[PDB]
Structures are given as structure tokens and as C-alpha cells.
Amino acid sequence: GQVQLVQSGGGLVQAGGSLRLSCAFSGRTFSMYTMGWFRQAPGKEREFVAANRGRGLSPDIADSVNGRFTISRDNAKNTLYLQMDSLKPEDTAVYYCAADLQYGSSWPQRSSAEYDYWGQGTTVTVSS
């Protein structure tokens, strides 16, 4: 078995608006993966945003987006979402989803070097 993550969504959006990003999972046993979102703004390093390890467990959300961004997974469609509300220009970045096999890893998991599969990235720009 392989894992493949396919991202959809993204665009140019005005501050205070709202977007939802999608990350489709392809492979076996969605539920054995921690799923996460990372972002990389121009110039800076990859930054942790949010992660989810399964339906009935609390997410791990970065301080910078707590109260604005929410993460959820759809088990029916094997899809990870990132709902971005109250967008700010500082949210401008390329957004990546990633998967971490839970066996042999740990929770919470904010280190990008510990994730094992990555989506292709989604560009989100927030204008004033």
C-alpha cells in the first residue's frame, strides 16, 4: 500500500472571508494516520497549523489560528478539511496537508520531518 494525498481549494480572497481546503486520501485505513496541515509563507519556514488523529479525539491547533481555523475529517469520503474563517493577510501562504502513520510516532505531532506523506500544496492569498 501507498498513500496519495490530493489537495483542492485555494484562491485569492479578501480579508475577513472564509475558505475551506480539502485533502483527499487514497490508500488503506485512513484511520491509522494522523492528518495535519502545514503552511509556508514567502520567505519563512514550514509552520504547523493543525492536526487530527481520529473522529472522537480533540484536534491540535496552532496558537496563531486558534478560534479561526477548524480541522475535521470525513470518514465517508476519506477527506481532510481545513475551514479557514476570519482570514487575515498574515494567513497568506502555501498550505500542505500531510499524513503520519500513528504506529511508531506520537501525538501531538507538530514536527514536519516526522510526517510521511505530503500533498502537492495549495496557494491561499488574502488581500485587504
Residue numbers in the entry: 1 to 128
Quoted from the paper:
In this work, we describe the expression, purification, crystallization and structural analysis of the variable fragment of an antibody BCD090-M2, which demonstrated an affinity to the extracellular domain of ErbB3 in preliminary experiments. In conclusion, here were present expression and purification, functional and structural analysis of a new single-domain llama antibody against human ErbB3. The phage display selection of antibodies from immunized llamas and subsequent sequencing allowed the identification of several anti-ErbB3 single-chain antibodies. The surface plasmon resonance experiment confirmed that the recombinant VHH antibody was functional and efficiently bound to the immobilized receptor.
The protein was successfully crystallized in two different forms: in space group C2 with a single copy of BCD090-M2 in the asymmetric unit and in P1 with two molecules and two cadmium ions in the unit cell. The crystal structures of the VHH antibody in space groups C2 and P1 were solved by molecular replacement at 1.6 and 1.9 Å resolution. Surprisingly, the CDR H2 existed in multiple distant conformations in different crystal forms, while the more complex CDR H3 had a low structural variability. α RMSD for CDR H3 between two structures was 0.61 (chain A) and 0.57 Å (chain B). The quality of electron density maps allowed us to unambiguously trace the loop and place amino-acid side chains. We crystallized the antibody in two different forms and solved high-resolution structures, giving an insight to the organization of the putative ErbB3 binding paratope.
